[PDB]
Structure formats: C-alpha cells, structure tokens
Write an enzyme that holds these catalytic residues in place. Structure first.
Site, PDB file in Angstrom:
ATOM      1  N   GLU A 152       0.830  -1.196   0.000  1.00  0.00           N
ATOM      2  CA  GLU A 152       0.000   0.000   0.000  1.00  0.00           C
ATOM      3  C   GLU A 152       0.871   1.255   0.000  1.00  0.00           C
ATOM      4  OE1 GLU A 152      -2.966  -0.551   3.204  1.00  0.00           O
ATOM      5  OE2 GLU A 152      -3.283  -2.442   2.165  1.00  0.00           O
ATOM      6  N   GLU A 167      -2.639  -7.364  -3.554  1.00  0.00           N
ATOM      7  CA  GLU A 167      -1.904  -6.136  -3.332  1.00  0.00           C
ATOM      8  C   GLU A 167      -0.411  -6.307  -3.599  1.00  0.00           C
ATOM      9  OE1 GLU A 167      -3.047  -4.116   0.414  1.00  0.00           O
ATOM     10  OE2 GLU A 167      -5.075  -4.803  -0.031  1.00  0.00           O
ATOM     11  N   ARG A 217     -11.446  -7.886  -0.232  1.00  0.00           N
ATOM     12  CA  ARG A 217     -12.055  -6.993   0.749  1.00  0.00           C
ATOM     13  C   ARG A 217     -12.232  -5.590   0.176  1.00  0.00           C
ATOM     14  NH1 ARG A 217      -6.859  -5.361   4.661  1.00  0.00           N
ATOM     15  NH2 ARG A 217      -5.527  -4.716   2.909  1.00  0.00           N
ATOM     16  N   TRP A 268      -9.513   2.990  16.247  1.00  0.00           N
ATOM     17  CA  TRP A 268      -8.775   2.704  15.017  1.00  0.00           C
ATOM     18  C   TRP A 268      -9.590   2.845  13.725  1.00  0.00           C
ATOM     19  CZ3 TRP A 268      -9.609  -1.079  18.879  1.00  0.00           C
ATOM     20  CH2 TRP A 268     -10.578  -2.047  18.576  1.00  0.00           C
ATOM     21  N   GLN A 305      -0.947   2.512  10.711  1.00  0.00           N
ATOM     22  CA  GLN A 305      -0.832   2.672   9.272  1.00  0.00           C
ATOM     23  C   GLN A 305      -2.028   3.205   8.473  1.00  0.00           C
ATOM     24  OE1 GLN A 305      -2.038   0.512   6.620  1.00  0.00           O
ATOM     25  NE2 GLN A 305      -0.809   1.520   5.022  1.00  0.00           N
ATOM     26  N   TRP A 334       4.857  -0.331  25.332  1.00  0.00           N
ATOM     27  CA  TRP A 334       4.455  -1.701  25.645  1.00  0.00           C
ATOM     28  C   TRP A 334       5.675  -2.588  25.927  1.00  0.00           C
ATOM     29  CZ3 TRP A 334       0.417  -4.020  27.385  1.00  0.00           C
ATOM     30  CH2 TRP A 334       0.196  -5.391  27.174  1.00  0.00           C
ATOM     31  N   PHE A 356       0.479   3.304  23.258  1.00  0.00           N
ATOM     32  CA  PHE A 356       1.261   2.179  22.764  1.00  0.00           C
ATOM     33  C   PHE A 356       2.579   2.694  22.190  1.00  0.00           C
ATOM     34  CE2 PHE A 356       1.693  -1.249  19.332  1.00  0.00           C
ATOM     35  CZ  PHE A 356       1.940  -2.289  20.220  1.00  0.00           C
ATOM     36  N   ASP A 365      -4.483   3.652  25.958  1.00  0.00           N
ATOM     37  CA  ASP A 365      -5.278   2.439  26.079  1.00  0.00           C
ATOM     38  C   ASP A 365      -5.145   1.842  27.470  1.00  0.00           C
ATOM     39  OD1 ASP A 365      -2.576   1.729  24.638  1.00  0.00           O
ATOM     40  OD2 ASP A 365      -3.199  -0.071  25.728  1.00  0.00           O
ATOM     41  N   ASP A 376      -4.814  -1.138  28.378  1.00  0.00           N
ATOM     42  CA  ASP A 376      -3.791  -2.171  28.480  1.00  0.00           C
ATOM     43  C   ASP A 376      -2.404  -1.605  28.805  1.00  0.00           C
ATOM     44  OD1 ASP A 376      -3.169  -4.875  28.498  1.00  0.00           O
ATOM     45  OD2 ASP A 376      -4.117  -5.208  26.550  1.00  0.00           O
ATOM     46  N   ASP A 377      -1.944  -0.626  28.032  1.00  0.00           N
ATOM     47  CA  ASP A 377      -0.644  -0.023  28.295  1.00  0.00           C
ATOM     48  C   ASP A 377      -0.669   0.657  29.656  1.00  0.00           C
ATOM     49  OD1 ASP A 377       1.408  -0.172  26.070  1.00  0.00           O
ATOM     50  OD2 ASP A 377      -0.361   0.417  24.923  1.00  0.00           O
ATOM     51  N   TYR A 414      -9.621   1.305  24.128  1.00  0.00           N
ATOM     52  CA  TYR A 414      -9.599   2.759  24.003  1.00  0.00           C
ATOM     53  C   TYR A 414     -10.838   3.510  24.499  1.00  0.00           C
ATOM     54  CZ  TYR A 414      -5.664   1.543  20.968  1.00  0.00           C
ATOM     55  OH  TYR A 414      -4.472   1.066  20.475  1.00  0.00           O
ATOM     56  N   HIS A 454      -5.338  -7.960  32.814  1.00  0.00           N
ATOM     57  CA  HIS A 454      -4.188  -7.102  33.066  1.00  0.00           C
ATOM     58  C   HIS A 454      -4.524  -5.993  34.042  1.00  0.00           C
ATOM     59  CE1 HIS A 454      -2.368  -8.343  28.911  1.00  0.00           C
ATOM     60  NE2 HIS A 454      -2.167  -9.253  29.847  1.00  0.00           N
ATOM     61  N   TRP A 493      -6.122  -9.800  22.046  1.00  0.00           N
ATOM     62  CA  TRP A 493      -4.927  -9.159  21.503  1.00  0.00           C
ATOM     63  C   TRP A 493      -3.680 -10.035  21.492  1.00  0.00           C
ATOM     64  CZ3 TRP A 493      -5.873  -4.719  19.003  1.00  0.00           C
ATOM     65  CH2 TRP A 493      -7.031  -4.011  19.349  1.00  0.00           C
ATOM     66  N   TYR A 524      -3.126 -17.502  25.673  1.00  0.00           N
ATOM     67  CA  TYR A 524      -2.854 -16.108  26.004  1.00  0.00           C
ATOM     68  C   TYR A 524      -3.875 -15.572  26.993  1.00  0.00           C
ATOM     69  CZ  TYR A 524      -2.116 -11.085  25.559  1.00  0.00           C
ATOM     70  OH  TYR A 524      -1.882  -9.762  25.824  1.00  0.00           O
ATOM     71  N   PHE A 531      -6.654  -8.439  14.816  1.00  0.00           N
ATOM     72  CA  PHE A 531      -8.092  -8.668  14.719  1.00  0.00           C
ATOM     73  C   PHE A 531      -8.291 -10.157  14.516  1.00  0.00           C
ATOM     74  CE2 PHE A 531      -7.998  -4.373  12.553  1.00  0.00           C
ATOM     75  CZ  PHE A 531      -8.344  -3.697  13.719  1.00  0.00           C
ATOM     76  N   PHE A 545      -6.213 -10.074  11.049  1.00  0.00           N
ATOM     77  CA  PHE A 545      -4.942  -9.363  11.066  1.00  0.00           C
ATOM     78  C   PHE A 545      -4.115  -9.877  12.222  1.00  0.00           C
ATOM     79  CE2 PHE A 545      -2.359  -5.437  11.744  1.00  0.00           C
ATOM     80  CZ  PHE A 545      -1.841  -5.345  10.463  1.00  0.00           C
ATOM     81  N   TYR A 586       5.158  -9.901  17.756  1.00  0.00           N
ATOM     82  CA  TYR A 586       5.785  -9.070  18.774  1.00  0.00           C
ATOM     83  C   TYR A 586       7.166  -9.622  19.055  1.00  0.00           C
ATOM     84  CZ  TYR A 586       1.445  -6.522  19.820  1.00  0.00           C
ATOM     85  OH  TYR A 586       0.324  -5.729  19.712  1.00  0.00           O
TER      86      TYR A 586
HETATM   87  C1  LIG Z   1      -0.934  -6.175  23.338  1.00  0.00           C
HETATM   88  C2  LIG Z   1      -1.379  -4.916  23.418  1.00  0.00           C
HETATM   89  C3  LIG Z   1      -2.626  -4.461  22.690  1.00  0.00           C
HETATM   90  N1  LIG Z   1      -2.618  -3.030  22.361  1.00  0.00           N
HETATM   91  C4  LIG Z   1      -1.891  -2.739  21.085  1.00  0.00           C
HETATM   92  C5  LIG Z   1      -2.760  -2.346  19.837  1.00  0.00           C
HETATM   93  C6  LIG Z   1      -2.215  -1.182  18.997  1.00  0.00           C
HETATM   94  C7  LIG Z   1      -2.116  -2.624  18.440  1.00  0.00           C
HETATM   95  C8  LIG Z   1      -3.027  -2.850  17.185  1.00  0.00           C
HETATM   96  O1  LIG Z   1      -2.521  -1.952  16.137  1.00  0.00           O
HETATM   97  C9  LIG Z   1      -3.134  -1.961  14.851  1.00  0.00           C
HETATM   98  C10 LIG Z   1      -2.349  -1.697  13.690  1.00  0.00           C
HETATM   99  C11 LIG Z   1      -2.937  -1.696  12.391  1.00  0.00           C
HETATM  100  C12 LIG Z   1      -4.330  -1.957  12.232  1.00  0.00           C
HETATM  101  C13 LIG Z   1      -4.970  -1.960  10.827  1.00  0.00           C
HETATM  102  O2  LIG Z   1      -4.283  -2.285   9.864  1.00  0.00           O
HETATM  103  C14 LIG Z   1      -6.421  -1.574  10.562  1.00  0.00           C
HETATM  104  C15 LIG Z   1      -7.218  -2.356   9.665  1.00  0.00           C
HETATM  105  C16 LIG Z   1      -8.571  -1.998   9.417  1.00  0.00           C
HETATM  106  C17 LIG Z   1      -9.132  -0.851  10.070  1.00  0.00           C
HETATM  107 BR1  LIG Z   1     -10.893  -0.348   9.785  1.00  0.00          BR
HETATM  108  C18 LIG Z   1      -8.336  -0.079  10.955  1.00  0.00           C
HETATM  109  C19 LIG Z   1      -6.997  -0.435  11.198  1.00  0.00           C
HETATM  110  C20 LIG Z   1      -5.108  -2.219  13.398  1.00  0.00           C
HETATM  111  C21 LIG Z   1      -4.521  -2.218  14.692  1.00  0.00           C
HETATM  112  C22 LIG Z   1      -4.014  -2.523  22.335  1.00  0.00           C
HETATM  113  C23 LIG Z   1      -5.059  -3.059  23.353  1.00  0.00           C
HETATM  114  C24 LIG Z   1      -4.463  -1.654  23.518  1.00  0.00           C
END
Ligand SMILES: C=CCN(C[C@H]1C[C@@H]1COc1ccc(C(=O)c2ccc(Br)cc2)cc1)C1CC1
Ligand SMILES: C=CCN(C[C@H]1C[C@@H]1COc1ccc(C(=O)c2ccc(Br)cc2)cc1)C1CC1
Ligand SMILES: CCCCCCCCOCCOCCOCCOCCO
Ligand SMILES: CCCCCCCCOCCOCCOCCOCCO
Lengths: 619, 619
Positions: free
Chosen positions: A36, A84, A118, A160, A253, A303, A356, A365, A367-368, A411, A442, A480, A486, A592, A596, A600
């Site tokens: 992208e 892509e 998608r 997000w 991103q 984090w 984060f 957030d 969590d942090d 959040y 946590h 997460w 986990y 997700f 996604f 780490y």
């Molecule tokens: C272990 C700790 C957990 N913390 C870390 C979190 C910040 C990390 C998740 O970060 C992202 C990064 C990119 C995306 C997308 O690509 C996305 C794709 C589609 C859409 Br619509 C939007 C974004 C998404 C999330 C959070 C609970 C505090």
C-alpha cells in the site's frame, strides 16, 4: 538448572535496552503495509527508485513456494494480501511473465479474481483506476453531522476505525483517480471464470444498508450536494485537530495513509500537517539486513518497555537497579495529561493513561496504562513524588474507564454498538471496541499489585465479568494475543493476584485445560488458525512466549511443582540460544481475530524471562 | 561620470545575492518585537538565558540618550515602545534603579503611565498579570459565527488584522494570567499624577461599541456561555487550516505570537502545529555583530529579489544573464497555486499571485505579484514555457483582484468596510485593506511592460482612480513607503509606462512638486513625520532611496536632462560607498501610517541602481 537460563536471559534483555532507557522491538504484520505504501508513493508522486528496490526484495522474500503470501507465517494463502503484493510488484517493475508473478496470478484467478477481495483492496485499486468506484461501499462526509448520541455517529466506531472513516469520507467524497502507467495496468485480475465469492459485512448485511449504499451512490452522482463543502471541512478539521506528534494519526498505518491522501486531494501538500505527516513515516520503516525494507503497522516502545521491566523484576533485579530506573524515569515522561477522544464519554475523568507508541496523546489504552502503572509500582525511583503521583493519575483513569459489564475495553467505554458491524464498508476486522478478557485481566493484576482485593466492588464486577465469559472447556479467549493460552494465562494469573481462591472449580477447570494441551516437546503452542477453526484451540507448534503463558497460568494456580510445569520449564531451558534469547518463527500476537495478525519481536525474550522469574519465586 | 558609480553598484548587488539565487535584506522595525518575544518566552516557559542576554544588549543599544525608544530612527519617544522595553529589561534582570531604567521610567510617568498605552501593550501586561483584563477591549470567540456578509465578520478586516483577531478571541475567551516573579512586577508604571491620555479607536468611538464592550465584559463574567465551546473550536480550526509553511501565521509577528499563546491555553503544546510554530521562529531572528539579537516583524525575500532583478536589468545586465536566471528560476518556484482567503470574494479566480515571505500560500499580495510578474517579463529563462505560463497566471490573478474604484488593494478586493475602525480594540495602525495609489501604480507599470496602454478599460479605470486621488499640490500619498516622494515617484513612473502623456497638467504639477523639494545637497528626503505633520511632506534628511524615487519621477516625466535631475544624480554618485553600496540611517518604509515604520535594508542599494540605470537610458 534454570538459573543459568534465567541469568543469560536477563543479561540479554539488558543488552537490547536502548540508551534513553526503553525497549523497542519491531512489530510484524504482512505485505499489505509495504504494498500500500508503494501505491501511496505513486499517488503522492514521491517514488524513490532505491526504496522501491528494497521493497521488492522484501515482497519476494516473503512470498512462498506456491507464490502466495499469508497473514501469519505458515498460514493459508491470502487473496487480498496476494493481490496487493502482485500489483505492487508489477508497478515496481516485474513483468506478468516472471515465475513469481505467474504463480500469484494463478492463485488470484482460482479465487474469483479482484471481485473477491475486501473493500480496502478494491478501494486502493479504485484509487489508481483499476476498479470502478461505483462498486465500492460509499462513506459520505455527511457522517460528520451525526451527533454524539445517534446511530452511526463516528464515536460509535472503535478508535482505530474512527479516524480511518473520517479520512476516507473526504476521499470517497471526491472519488479521485491517480492512473497507473500502461506498463502496470492489471486487467488480468479480472480474467477468471471462477464465481466471485464476495466477503460480506462482519456481522451480516441488512437490506437497509444495502439499500442505503445504493442510495448514497446515486446521491453521489447528483450535480449539487448541499452542505457537503461543510461536511468535508468538518472531517478535515477533525483530522487536523487530532494529528499525532510524530506526524501520524493514531500511530497506526491505515488512517495515517488515508489522511495523507485526503490532504493531497485538498491541494494541501504545502501545509505543515501534510509535510510532518509525510516525513514522520520514516520512523516506522525498517532496514532489513538482506537488503529489504518493511513498514511497521504500528510501534510498541511503551508496551515493550512496560513488560521488559516487569520481567526483569520478577526475574530478580533490584527495584532500584540503575538500569531499570532509566526505564522508570522514561515511562513517567510518557504519561498523557490531556483529554483524548475517550473524554467524549467521560468528561469529568482526569487524564493519566499511556499510549502504545511514542507520542500519541489522544489515544491512550487501558492495556498499556495498566501494565505501565503496575510496572512503576515495582520500582524505586529517585523522585518518589512523581512516581506516587503518576501511578495515582493512571490508576484513577483506569478505574474511570471501566465499562458497564465490569470489564475493560482498549480505548473506550462501552464502545459496544452493534450497529456499525453491518455497514457494507466494514468487511475487515473489528470495527468496535467492546470489553475483553485479556485487558480486564491485566487491569485486575495491576490493581492486585497494590493490594485491592475481591473486597472492592470494582474488582468483583470484573471477576463476575470473567466468570461469565469463561468458555465451556474452562479456557478464555485471547483478543490481543494468540489465543486461548494467552487469555487463560492472563486471567488465571490476574485472579490469583486479586486474592481469589485458586482452588475454586472454574480455576481448576482452566488449569487442567492448560496441562491438557502441553505438546510432546514439553512446550505449548497455539496456531493462529484457532480463530478460524476450534480444532486448533491450544494446538500448534510450541513457542517460547505461549509456553511461558501456559506456564504462568500453572505457576499462578499452584501447580508450579507439577510435571507439566517442570516439563515446560525444561523446554525453555533447552530451546534457549547461547546469547540468552529465544527464537519464535510464529506470530503470537493478534490484531483482529481471523483477519490481522502481529509478530511481537520482544515477546519471545520477555515472557520466558518473566515466567522463569515467577517459577524461581515458587521455590 | 555615473557609469563608474553604476558599475560599482551592480557588482555590489550581485555580491549580496544568495546561492539559491535570491536577495534577502533584514527588515527593521522597533523593540516591541523583541520585547514581546521575551514575554512570549515567559508565557511558554521557554527562557534561554543566553538569548535574553543578546536581547538585553539589543534593547539597551537601541535606547537613546533620553532613555526612550522610537518607532523610527530619529523619531520622538514612543510611550508604548518604551513601556514594553522597560518591562522586558526588568524581566531580564535590570533593576529599576540603573540609569537606563530611571530615564525610561520618568518618560513613562510624565505621560500618564500604563493607562496611556495602546490596547496591545495593556493586553500583554494583562497576560502577565500587571493589568486588569476587565479594562481591555473584549473580542469574543463568537465573532466566528458572523457570516460572510455581515457587520464585523472576520473577512471585513484586513488580512493582517483578521488572523490576529481570531487568535486573540481564544485568548480573551479564557483571559489567562501568567504571573511574573516579584522581582519583575512593574507597579511603578501606575505611579503618576499626570492625567491618563488614552488613545481611541482609529476612526472614532460611537457610544454603541463602547456599550457593546461593557456588555461583553459582563457576559464574560457569567457562569455559562452557550455555544462558546463551539465558537472557540471554530477559531482554533480556522487557525490550524491557515498555518504557514514555516510554522508562522501570515508571515508576520502578531498573529503568530498570539496563535502560539492560544494553542498553549488549549493544552496543545504537544501538537504538531505548535511545535512547528515554535521552532519556525528562529528563521526570523537575527544575530547582531555587537552581541545583540533582533526579531524581524516579517521577511522580504521575494520582494527583495523582485526589485533586485528589475534594478540590475534597468542597470544594464542581459535579460539572459546567468546570474539573473538563478533568480528567475527561483521566482517561478514561488508562485502560489491554491485558493487563499482572497478567494472568499473571488471564487472563480485562478490562483497565481506571489507572497512577501518565503512560504505563505494563503496570503499573496498584489504588490509582490506585480513586481515579480513584471521582473520575469524582463528575463529570458531556459524554459520559456513556464515563464510564459507563470506570467499569464499571475497577470490574470492581478486583473481579477482589481477593486471597485479601479485601484488595487494589497491582499483583498474591496476590503473597505469602515465599520471595524470604530471598535474599542482597534486603536493601532490600519485594520482594513482598501486600494492604494502605490500598489495601483506598480500594477499599471507591470501591465505597461507588456504593452496594455490607456486603450484597455482596466488601465483607464485605474488612471481615473489615481487622478481623483492626487493631492492639491500635485503629490501622491505613500501607503507602504515613506512617503509623498514614494507615491509620486511610483505613480508618475507608472503613468509614463502605460502610455499616458507626461506633458499633461497634473503630471507637470507633480514633476514640479518634486523639483521643489530637492534638498540643498542635491538629494531628496522625507521624514516619517510627514504622516503626522503635513509640514514635513517632502522634507527630511536626504536618503539614497528617496533620492532615487524623486529621480525616477523626473526621468519618467521627461525632465531627465534637467538641473534638479543631474543634481540628484550627483548626490548618489558622491554619497556612494567604496564597496558600491549606499548608507541609509533612516527608515523609508511604511507599515502603518503614523503607527508602524520599517527599514528596508535593500532599498538603499536597489533603488539608486535602478534610478541610475534609468538615467543612463535617458541618454
Ligand atoms: C498487546 C497490546 C494491545 N494493544 C496494542 C494495539 C495497537 C495494536 C493494534 O494496532 C493496529 C495496527 C494496524 C491496524 C490496521 O491495519 C487496521 C485495519 C482496518 C481498520 Br478499519 C483499521 C486499522 C489495526 C490495529 C491494544 C489493546 C491496547
Ligand atoms: C512594499 C511592499 C508592500 N508589502 C509589504 C507588507 C508586508 C509588510 C507589512 O508587514 C507587517 C509586519 C508587522 C505588522 C504588525 O506588527 C501588526 C500590528 C497590528 C496588527 Br492588528 C496586525 C499586525 C503588520 C504588517 C505589502 C503591500 C503588500
Ligand atoms: C478547542 C476548544 C478547546 C475546548 C476543547 C477541550 C475540551 C474538549 O474535550 C475533549 C473532546 O474530545 C476530543 C479530543 O481530542 C483533542 C483535540 O482537540 C483539541 C483540543 O480541544
Ligand atoms: C475542505 C473543503 C474543500 C473546500 C476548499 C476549497 C477552497 C474554498 O475556498 C475557501 C477559501 O479560504 C481559504 C482556505 O484555504 C485554507 C485551508 O482550508 C483547507 C482547504 O481549502
């Protein structure tokens, strides 16, 4: 026995610490980020031949034998991710003939082609003119008019998704097209007989939205759309106000990229925000030793530092270790003291959470904030005043963020509207931010470090939440982090910390579940497939991190002096490298569920150290 | 004779040219800039001892024997300018006892004290808590709601005033107070028996506004002001959208400083706009060889380059001189191509003007645009395509800017509302931007270079404007340059260029007026007092610039082979330095008649060269 393991692990971690005093492992995702980016560069007419090269090496390097790309290492081929990458490479120079392009093309075609991807993928292509805008779910600037309490107002979406929506409404408002040169046109993406299998809205599509979309696409065609100039400016202003300090947006991103495109549409390339937004990008990029270059979906300095500290402490180092102090001081400077988007639901709540990334004040957030505040509570810093103060501000903010059901989201508070899950546009990942077991865990473990037990009403409301969420087999979902190992690890560890009795039935039903999935090699592992197919829950190759998680669940539940327990410790001891670290070719992080995944980099070093440190405590 | 003079002048200018190819002389004003900066630093809690030092040396160095400071060199003591410098020094370290502090204090007291100072001065003091906010003319955020066509809507003010108003509405909305340490409190500013002689609104104060103010200050005291949160954000957003590329606002000191203060009020010190806004400041500062440090009220790179080229050409160098090309190319890259605030009155007008400073896309001015387009019209650049194109875009933008009366304003079209001149707040300089003779002249001269004579309706409408404005004695006012010599020179030079007949009566009545003021030493000079007392029109010590202006009026009007004419040429030939340049201890530039004066460092070198180049043409 393990002592030498632990000793080497410690000195290793300490060697990774940066000068300023924080830890920062790269975050791993998938080629859509880099692909992208190449397109973003084309749009903004800022293509660097040298960079394109490093990007081509990375893309190929990531492609598999079959010619596809997956979301996680060792995962099934992904259509979107592959489409892509295909277009990205073709733009950089690859001809559709070359072996790699050939294999990819096949897989893409055997899937129904571009029509099965998608929304985002079809949208990106729409942006370069390789797909009609008319077929892309519409999101109007006018969404900006919806009030705080109204269906689909932008605060019903997760943090997000929110920014991404706002930025895209400006883009979709003008539906711009930045043509690719003939050499890169990708019509072949349509050449398929296979029936297009289109993915639908995350939670099913009601004919209403379907209708509404068709409606919006027709309205789009009109000659005059009243108050739209206003609608757009409302979006632009919403953006300009929230721009992060590093020049990004939310520190992720997606919105960041779209926000830049939006400013480009609005002839604002010579504006401070766009400039800063553009050069801020470099901070997220990474030079790969094999000549490649990758872009981080996000960054985890806070984090990483937070867990790093908790691990080194549980491992042994003094609460006043001069090296852990460099960290403690650094963390205090990170605390956010201004209202963020979360304030829309809690106007009288005093700021005090953490983010984060490095500089992201509007989006802390839970969590942090919980891990950082807890980590601080385990240190002895020079200025005991600021440490006492920081912890209290954060502590209070966390409490005030607790949702209705008694659990915590990431959040926002009660970001549970089920409405946005049905819009046509929303067919990828999560779009709302409801409370989750892992975050809630946590938080409890954090309060537990202070003492606050099952006596306090807050703690109980949360434990009630967890008990109700526990799965039939006594395991807990992993929002997460991948996955049941986990979550279970998190919960049991937390519950142990808030005084709850580890002998209870539900706790045992969980502990048992953990012993029941210990792989032969002594370790534990859960494949990212466990989000798609329940047959994989607790199954998968053993990884240092996941082993450490199941290991904490056991140590916490009293079964530290068990077979499964000692077995797992052995695993970590043997598999450890000479320098002290561990290897982990699999992703144990979740962005997700089912959509996604993340890698780490520090997890493999920090969690095993923490688990071993807690094991050493059990004796 | 003069050839050697001109030859030296040329090589000198060519030596001042920067590498990139532009000229940039420092702009001189008065100590309020630096004094306000010291206070700004206090507010933002960013005081650099080392800088305060350089600032103290500057402040002292500028003070005169009597212990006061003036607007221009050799001007009467100014109360405002002196009060601010007094407080500034006291903050830096000076004790009220020391000689400089003592003389200043006296002058201040003998004037009625702090109660006789302009609004700004009392406001700045209000900001540090040395004066009650209640006594400061109120300007509410709500002014943001007034529509495009309504009394006192922000587009009825001149560009420079507008941004200042918007920024201050946020400040005055919160009426913040940043206390000075006891050591710097300035109560002594009140210790006076003399009756406070307060300055009123530029055009007189109707009891209505006086009432309205009292109303606002009362409304300010209420416990709840509905829609004010919204009013503020409207101002904040208005600012965020318009921030200049260098981090400034408009490229002028005032709004820039207030905008920073506003962002500070709104806890936005970690926001990009603020950071960029703060660090952009250094570009305007200047290290003084005697250890001092001054801050430019604004910067003139484009302007300097524009005249520099026109002079070097009229002087002799080839239209394709490789050195003038560096300039021509540079100027093309400056052209603005996006809608600015001017578009609010000309939505169908295509962008193409130029700005004064380096990067200020939202505020191009007719003056720079005219001089730059004309200067390009005198060159031969490699890419005759971009030159042809650029000129056209600018040309057209100029035409579309022409106001109703046939003359041109600076930044806007028909910005002639007389309403804002009566508000309590507006007691310093101009607040509106109506058409002026000098700008209009430069425009006509520009068109003239192309050919467009008196035949074209545009030209005539303008000439009619000029004829109607001409003063009784045949002279023309000088809006952006001191003064009648500046205007008259401009007009007559222009009129000559647009074909008009130099023999006409009004032209002669002007030419005579010029000759009638030629000082004995052969040169010409006009003191800045000519804005306050008509006795000084055409009177004052002779300066290289003003001599060159009166000299151009003559050369243009045919009287090039005259006594007065050859006499003046002698002046420049003698007074010229060995390096080639000239000296000019006086200000020949105007910011606001009777209120703000400027020193254009390049004027002394460029205009005499241009005048001599045009004299050499007459033979
Ligand atoms: C272990 C700790 C957990 N913390 C870390 C979190 C910040 C990390 C998740 O970060 C992202 C990064 C990119 C995306 C997308 O690509 C996305 C794709 C589609 C859409 Br619509 C939007 C974004 C998404 C999330 C959070 C609970 C505090
Ligand atoms: C010869 C060329 C003519 N051009 C030069 C122009 C840029 C110079 C005027 O610039 C300034 C600088 C400072 C102020 C204020 O201090 C001020 C004080 C009070 C308030 Br209220 C606002 C600002 C103001 C103006 C213009 C016609 C294009
Ligand atoms: C601009 C007016 C200042 C008043 C607003 C501060 C209080 C607003 O509550 C926070 C609302 O949630 C949005 C926050 O993101 C912050 C960025 O907006 C800039 C500061 O107002
Ligand atoms: C953001 C909606 C797009 C409409 C902008 C077109 C320009 C309309 O003219 C307004 C003129 O005011 C000057 C504004 O330029 C400053 C930045 O505002 C951002 C986009 O124009």
């Amino acid at each position: 026995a393990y002592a030498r393991t632990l000793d080497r692990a410690v000195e290793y971690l300490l060697s990774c610490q940066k000068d300023e005093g924080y830890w920062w492992g790269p975050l791993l995702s998938n080629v859509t980020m880099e692909a992208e980016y190449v397109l973003l560069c084309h749009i903004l007419d800022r293509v660097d031949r040298d960079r394109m090269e490093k990007i081509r090496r990375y893309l190929l390097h990531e492609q598999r034998e079959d010619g596809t790309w997956a979301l996680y290492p060792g995962g099934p081929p992904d259509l979107d991710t592959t489409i892509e990458a295909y277009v990205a490479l073709k733009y950089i120079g690859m001809s559709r003939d070359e072996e790699p392009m050939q294999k990819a093309l096949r897989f893409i075609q055997s899937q129904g082609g571009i029509e099965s991807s998608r929304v985002f993928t079809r949208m990106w292509l729409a942006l370069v003119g390789e797909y009609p805008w008319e077929k892309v779910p519409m999101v109007p600037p006018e969404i900006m008019f919806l009030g705080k309490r109204m269906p689909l107002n932008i605060y019903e979406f997760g943090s997000w998704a929110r920014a991404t929506v706002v930025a895209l409404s400006i883009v979709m408002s003008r539906q711009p097209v930045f043509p690719l040169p003939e050499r890169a046109r990708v019509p072949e993406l349509y050449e398929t007989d296979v029936p297009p299998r289109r993915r639908g809205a995350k939670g099913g599509g009601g004919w209403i939205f379907d209708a509404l979309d068709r409606a919006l696409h027709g309205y789009q065609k009109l000659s005059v759309h009243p108050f739209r100039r206003a609608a757009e400016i409302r979006a632009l202003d919403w953006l300009l106000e929230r721009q992060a300090g590093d020049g990004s947006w939310g520190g992720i991103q997606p919105p960041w990229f779209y926000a830049l495109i939006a400013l480009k549409i609005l002839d604002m390339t010579q504006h401070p925000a766009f400039i800063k937004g553009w050069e801020g990008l470099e901070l997220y990029g990474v030079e790969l030793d094999y000549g490649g270059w990758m872009f981080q979906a996000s960054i985890s300095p806070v984090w990483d530092t937070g867990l790093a500290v908790l691990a080194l402490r549980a491992a042994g180092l003094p609460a006043d270790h001069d090296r852990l102090v460099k960290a403690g001081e650094w963390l205090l400077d990170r605390q956010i003291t201004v209202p963020g988007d979360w304030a829309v639901k809690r106007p009288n709540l005093k700021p005090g959470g953490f983010a984060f990334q490095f500089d992201n004040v509007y989006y802390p957030d839970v969590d942090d904030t919980a891990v950082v505040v807890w980590a601080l509570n385990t240190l002895r810093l020079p200025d005991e005043r600021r440490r006492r103060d920081a912890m209290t501000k954060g502590f209070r903010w966390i409490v005030g963020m607790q949702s209705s059901n008694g659990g915590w989201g990431a959040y926002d508070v009660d970001n549970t509207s089920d409405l946005p899950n049905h819009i046509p546009f929303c067919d990828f990942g999560e779009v709302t931010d409801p409370p989750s077991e892992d975050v809630t865990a946590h938080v409890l473990e954090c309060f537990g470090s202070f003492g606050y037990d099952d006596a306090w009403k807050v703690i109980r409301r949360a434990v009630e939440y967890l008990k109700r969420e526990q799965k039939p087999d006594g395991s807990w979902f992993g929002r997460w982090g991948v996955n049941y190992l986990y979550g279970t690890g998190a919960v049991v560890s937390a519950l142990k910390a808030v005084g709850i009795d580890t002998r209870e039935p539900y706790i045992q039903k969980a502990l048992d579940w953990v012993e029941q999935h210990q792989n032969p090699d002594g370790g534990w592992g859960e494949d990212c497939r466990s989000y798609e197919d329940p047959a994989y829950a607790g199954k998968g190759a053993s990884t240092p991190s996941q082993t450490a998680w199941a290991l904490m669940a056991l140590i916490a539940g009293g079964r530290a002096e068990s077979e499964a327990a000692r077995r797992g410790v052995q695993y970590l001891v043997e598999t450890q490298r000479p320098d002290g670290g561990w290897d982990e070719p699999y992703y144990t992080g979740t962005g997700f569920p089912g959509d996604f995944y993340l890698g780490y980099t520090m997890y493999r070093h920090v969690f095993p150290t923490l688990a071993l440190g807690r094991y050493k405590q059990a004796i």
